[PDB]
RNA sequence: GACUCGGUGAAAUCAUAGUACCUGUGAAGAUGCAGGUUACCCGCGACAGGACGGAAAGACCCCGUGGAGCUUUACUGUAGCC
RNA sequence: GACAAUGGUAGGAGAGCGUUCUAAGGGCGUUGAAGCAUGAUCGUAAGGACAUGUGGAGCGCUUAGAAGUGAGAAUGCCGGUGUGAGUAGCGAAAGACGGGUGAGAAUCCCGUCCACCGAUUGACUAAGGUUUCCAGAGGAAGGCUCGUCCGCUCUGGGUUAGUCGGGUCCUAAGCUGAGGCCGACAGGCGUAGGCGAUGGAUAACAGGUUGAUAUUCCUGUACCACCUAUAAUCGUUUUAAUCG
RNA sequence: GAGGGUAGCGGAGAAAUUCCAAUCGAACCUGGAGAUAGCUGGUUCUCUCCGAAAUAGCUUUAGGGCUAGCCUCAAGUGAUGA
RNA sequence: GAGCUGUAAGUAAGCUUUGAUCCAGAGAUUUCCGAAUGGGGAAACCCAGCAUGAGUUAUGUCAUGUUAUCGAUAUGUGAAUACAUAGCAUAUCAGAAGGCACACCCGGAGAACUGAAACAUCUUAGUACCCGGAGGAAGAGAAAGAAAAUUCGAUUCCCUUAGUAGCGGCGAGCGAAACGGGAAGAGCCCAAACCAACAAGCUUGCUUGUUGGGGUUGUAGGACACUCUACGGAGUUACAAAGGACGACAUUAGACGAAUCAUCUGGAAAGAUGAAUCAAAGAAGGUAAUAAUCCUGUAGUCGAAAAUGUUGUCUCUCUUGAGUGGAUCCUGAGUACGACGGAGCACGUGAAAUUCCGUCGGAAUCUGGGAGGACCAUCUCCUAAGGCUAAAUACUCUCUAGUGACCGAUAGUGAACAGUACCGUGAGGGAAAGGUGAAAAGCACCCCGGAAGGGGAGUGAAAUAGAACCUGAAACCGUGUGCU
């Protein structure tokens, strides 16, 4: 969740953040399944519920 | 370099030419005391009633020179290893008798 | 309390001072300049007209492309909310 | 040599004086260097000598080089010393006299008389301070005067608990908090549980005694916990007395 | 009375711009930091030669700045000066 | 190798040639607090459990061990729930935690005053401050590169290119790179195809798993096909890793080390005068004034029981290497790219190529894919989506040896004697203060005085050098007088 600028039409600048699309799903962690926060992109990509 | 019992000669100061012998050393300030040399007069209070007292004060060690045991002249001093042990030489003669 | 005597003993201030008045003159209201008029040298107790008396780089007024607080249908944004 | 020129603020140009250090050369100094003090000396100026006194170990001159290189002003900074001036003040109030001690007494000690407070200027306990407490010695500074005195200086001493107030007991507000929840990092919150009196629980009183401690020391008479012996009551240890 | 809580882009206020360590239209301390100051004050030895200006024009400019005018130093040309 | 019991002077009592004090190496001891860790707490204190042990008729007391939380490794046990699991318990290990010069380095987050003669894009500036992680350096690094010659051949740093090209309310300002010249120089390991085993399903075919081998690239390499070949090389700084021997240097204490006398002045000579000497030594500091020859030293030469640090030679430990076929198989996927919103690149989204982050979409497979500043075609160069890597470079709280046309007590560190007096609830702020003499020889004794002070006497070259002690200016305060 890095930072950056919000820009107006006159190009004034203000600090701002981009957050990740975190979702609370139940994934298999070593042994017992647990319920954690995972982004939607990582879910689409490399982990099974 | 002179020991505690030697017979030396004064080469500088008021008493230049006198012989005396060493009686104290004081190595940290390198000042020896020679009998009959550099006499002072103190005012001592009653501790018996005191008065003016005369003793010798210490003289700087580089104002004093040893005497050549043979020819009887002032000389510097070297060292030599005999029996794996260090002795003193007169820079004009041989060994220098310094026992006491 | 003040005043006189014994003890102890500060402060703001201060260019150097042997530091009069009148009518003028002058940065236009003079102890220090001009022309006169008064006045032997040195203290103590009192009074408050002047020294534009002391104290505080005027708070009024104006100026600086100097600050700050407040307002809004000044300009530009933005926390939030839909 | 003739002729001419020479007032000056912002400001331009030129030529110099002096200070500290370096290089090379050449010098001076315990028969007295630098510094300081005085003089009636020299140069157009900044400035340079000489003589005498003080001082007691370093210092000029020539040519060149390099700079923390020159002060009278900034309500400049630091130190010292004046003026105002023997002036203002000496912080609520009742003292007098006799005796003593001392180099020295209105001011210290003792006595008598007088006066002031008395729902308090009296007597206890807390906070807070931290040796100011006691004895002997002292009088430079402190004490708004004085001082032989002192909360000041020197030397040596003084605080005693099963029961008094805290801990080995309890909890309030609050603060922390294993796991836990949240958060760019740092970190924020919170469950069980802890900590935390200003409240609840809880066994000792009278007299004697020191220069300085006392419900603590001493005498007398008590009470409260815990441990071991001496024992009636104790009777499967369900039960029974017991404990829980 | 004792023990505690709220902290400056904030707290608390029976409301006065009131209080938050003798300070409050935004506490105190250290740092950016020698902030910036077209404003005021100050800026230390000597002699010699020359010697102004207080005016145009533009300027968010008017007690500021820029070019020209007037001063000085050096070189050059040669009647162009009065 | 003869004195010694800190600065630190005294007295006392002692130690030491049977070697003390002192210097270097290695050991032993090392209270309490503090991350502080048995529990608590207002640091430097209070209160405990368990196991041994001393003591007591027995309690009370004492001594020694052990007892934090997360983590790792075993074992046992196990809830709602039948198997299970979350948990729970026990035992071994000692992995983390805190600090700094945290200066330099790498990341996360990130101002304002200021400049533009106001100010908002821009600038100050990715600067200050804050947070995290480390090292003696860190970072970068082995071409999906730079270019356009006849090319070069990892990275970093210095000089130039150049205040150029460019960016920019095209304002204020910001500002490269390639070529060329140098310092230094170094390259490697995986994933995959494939092969050999082992194991579970399975039906023994396949799938999957584990180990090992192989194998690593562009004018394409490797698998496979085939043909020629063996222990010399390599190594602990990457490229795999441990440990022995014998050496050699360098540190960490030290030793030897040449050569001068006399007179004058003086308190004292190193000065002056005269006559000598050494020099691989005429650096420097002391000594009663200014010393190559008086002392400590200097040039030169020698030296280690012990512990470290380097560095050699053996040992040791590992290991075959070529060629042709070239397109049969393998060659890094939610990746590369794209759209939207941002940031970093000298570059303000623009002709913006090139490089990152958030949200959504989302390829190809050698007749492949990427770059050469929108885009297309042809040419040229390269082969992304895995990892490691010395040297040249930056810094100084320190240690060792030195240097200065650097200061000389209002200077130089705030501090020559201190982060102390003191100030503040606290964070914090923060001073002033050097010099007797060569040597204490630091004034015996007499007089006035309660003392303090003083006058003599004495010490000393000097006491108007007497501790408020080198020199001793000015302001300021007095006493006596020549003229008024
Ligand atoms: Mg006077």
Q: Where are the domains of chain A?
A: 1-49
Q: Which two tokens stand for residue A41?
A: 């992109």
Q: Are B8 and B65 in contact (CB under 8 A)?
A: yes
C1' (D122) to CA (A35) span, angstroms: 80
Q: Which two tokens stand for residue B12?
A: 């500088």
Positive/negative CA dihedral, B46, B48, B51, B57: negative
C1' nearest to CA of A11: which nucleotide? F121
Residues of the domain holding B27: 1-100
- List the resolution, Å: 2.5
How many structural domains are present in chain B? 1
C1' (F57) to CA (B5) span, angstroms: 76
- Give the integer Cα–Cα distance in Å for A10 and B28: 85
C1' (F298) to CA (B75) span, angstroms: 21
Method: cryo-EM
């Amino acid at each position: 969740a890095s930072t950056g600028n919000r820009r107006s039409h006159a190009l004034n600048s203000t600090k701002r953040r981009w957050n990740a699309n975190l979702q609370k799903v139940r994934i298999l962690v070593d042994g017992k399944p647990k319920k954690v926060w995972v982004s939607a992109r990582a879910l689409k990509s490399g982990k099974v519920t | 370099h002179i020991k505690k019992g030697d017979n030396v000669k004064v080469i500088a100061g008021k008493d230049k030419g006198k012989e005396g012998k060493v009686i104290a050393t004081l190595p940290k300030k390198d000042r020896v005391v020679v009998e009959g040399v550099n006499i002072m007069k103190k005012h001592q209070k009653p501790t018996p009633e005191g008065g003016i007292l005369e003793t010798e004060a210490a003289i700087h060690v580089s104002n004093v020179q040893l005497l050549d045991p043979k020819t009887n002249e002032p000389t510097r001093v070297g060292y030599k290893f005999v029996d794996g042990k260090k002795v003193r030489i007169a820079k004009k003669s041989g060994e220098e008798i310094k026992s006491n």
